[PDB]
Write a protein that binds this ligand. Structure first.
Ligand SMILES: NC(=O)c1ccc[n+]([C@@H]2O[C@H](COP(=O)([O-])OP(=O)(O)OC[C@H]3O[C@@H](n4cnc5c(N)ncnc54)[C@H](OP(=O)(O)O)[C@@H]3O)[C@@H](O)[C@H]2O)c1
Ligand SMILES: Nc1nc(=O)c2nc(CNc3ccc(C(=O)N[C@@H](CCC(=O)O)C(=O)O)cc3)cnc2[nH]1
Ligand SMILES: [Mn+2]
Ligand SMILES: [Mn+2]
Ligand SMILES: [Mn+2]
Length: 159
């Protein structure tokens, strides 16, 4: 099974200038809990944005060019990325925009955080078709002293 995990600001913005400008510790904790002990697939730009391997996960990087770091696994196509995960119950696709586009048609589950924040961005999560997806979990949180925007965790499953 393939799942996508992402945090979206208003208008599906996910990034600006190869960064995420907000800081929501509760959402990073949600990301870690839902990805730990699973393989994670990311594109090269997202690898550079994170800047280090994510511990406790098999890190698989898509790039058309040879890898430059043997602490992670480098692959050259979507099918190779999936194969490199082996026989696991759930593969997590962690972006960015171009990678989400390619894996969305193959995904059974979306883990989305909706952040109540207006962000100028240059990268968006794909338009998906709402009729294709059932909401199976949602949890709203008001802003607090640690998290400066309200946010909603949602899990959707392909109908
Ligand atoms: N809010 C969130 O949840 C979230 C999550 C992830 C990322 N982001 C943000 O998203 C932005 C990065 O997204 P992006 O769309 O620019 O880039 P991306 O999807 O992270 O990376 C694209 C790169 O991945 C490689 N690639 C993708 N598909 C491939 C394929 N089928 N075969 C081979 N290589 C492939 C290519 O690398 P080469 O050029 O080396 O061939 C391509 O240039 C940043 O702003 C980041 O902060 C946000
Ligand atoms: N909901 C969500 N939020 C995100 O921030 C996110 N980020 C990415 C890609 N970028 C990043 C950037 C940093 C870290 C990171 O530092 N993660 C630590 C945090 C642990 C914690 O804060 O409790 C990790 O070990 O996962 C992960 C992904 C992909 N999907 C996402 N999905
Ligand atoms: Mn092929
Ligand atoms: Mn197999
Ligand atoms: Mn806000």
């Amino acid at each position: 099974m393939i799942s996508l995990i992402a945090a979206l600001a208003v208008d599906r913005v996910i990034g600006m200038e190869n960064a995420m400008p907000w800081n929501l510790p509760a959402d990073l904790a949600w990301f870690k809990r839902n990805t730990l002990n699973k393989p994670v697939i990311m594109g090269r730009h997202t690898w550079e944005s994170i800047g280090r391997p994510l511990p406790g996960r098999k890190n698989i990087i898509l790039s058309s060019q040879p890898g430059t770091d043997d602490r992670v696994t480098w692959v050259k196509s979507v099918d190779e990325a999936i194969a490199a995960c082996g026989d696991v119950p759930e593969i997590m696709v962690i972006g960015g925009g171009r990678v989400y586009e390619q894996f969305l048609p193959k995904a059974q589950k979306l883990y989305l955080t909706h952040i109540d924040a207006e962000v100028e961005g240059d990268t968006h999560f794909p338009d998906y078709e709402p009729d294709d997806w059932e909401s199976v979990f949602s949890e709203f949180h008001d802003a607090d002293a640690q998290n400066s925007h309200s946010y909603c965790f949602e899990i959707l499953e392909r109908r």
